[PDB]
Amino acid sequence: MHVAQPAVVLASSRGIASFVCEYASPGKATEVRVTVLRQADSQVTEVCAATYMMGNELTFLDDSICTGTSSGNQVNLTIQGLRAMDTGLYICKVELMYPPPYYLGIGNGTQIYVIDPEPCPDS
Amino acid sequence: MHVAQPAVVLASSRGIASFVCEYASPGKATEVRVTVLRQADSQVTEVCAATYMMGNELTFLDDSICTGTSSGNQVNLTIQGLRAMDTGLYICKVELMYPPPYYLGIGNGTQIYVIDPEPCP
């Protein structure tokens, strides 16, 4: 299953990066699982993941780091609390969990560049 | 001549970006011209330029948004006043002007990413 996500995103001054992960639905999926994985160096790690009925909001483990909104064959993701060290490749994984059959799609990754604010005088 | 510059650089939250530009060591002390070209395909435009004798300090005198330092066959270019819309490809062009021969070197371009920061109250 084709998953597309932007090649590069810049985090804002507040360390919030947002991007669109959209999937090419092979059928009519009611339940979907989205996962954000961070790749680096040769390893992959799970950042956040929402399992949602398409017709409702997404709820994450922390949800202080990821938020998301579903809107058809796509989902608006937001990653928060980013610092420079978090610069890296963020992979969007999409799973269609219901109805059968299961489909799995993995996108090419979005490079997220993050900068730390410079010092600000007092106070 | 070979000119090396980093592939990607991030501007600070102050809208300042720096990168080193390195050229192939000339056979001798030479007058060197360093030029920053912004590439906005197919737009190519001079952002700033400076000339110095090797062994002297590089110093921009064009009143551009660029300042720089020099050491050996490297120059450290600092460009200030950048905003998000200035995100793009910045090419380091280096010319060995004289004593001859004349040599031209063009780097591969540094992609500079810039964000608009929050002010601080």
Ligand SMILES: *[C@@H]1O[C@H](CO)[C@@H](O)[C@H](O)[C@H]1NC(C)=O
């Ligand atoms: C999701 O992204 C679309 C554009 O792809 C945007 O128009 C829409 O406002 C976004 N939904 C939100 C902000 O929840």
Ligand SMILES: *[C@@H]1O[C@H](CO)[C@@H](O)[C@H](O)[C@H]1NC(C)=O
């Ligand atoms: C390049 O110049 C900037 C601004 O002066 C400085 O912060 C940085 O340390 C310099 N980098 C190198 C490699 O000299």
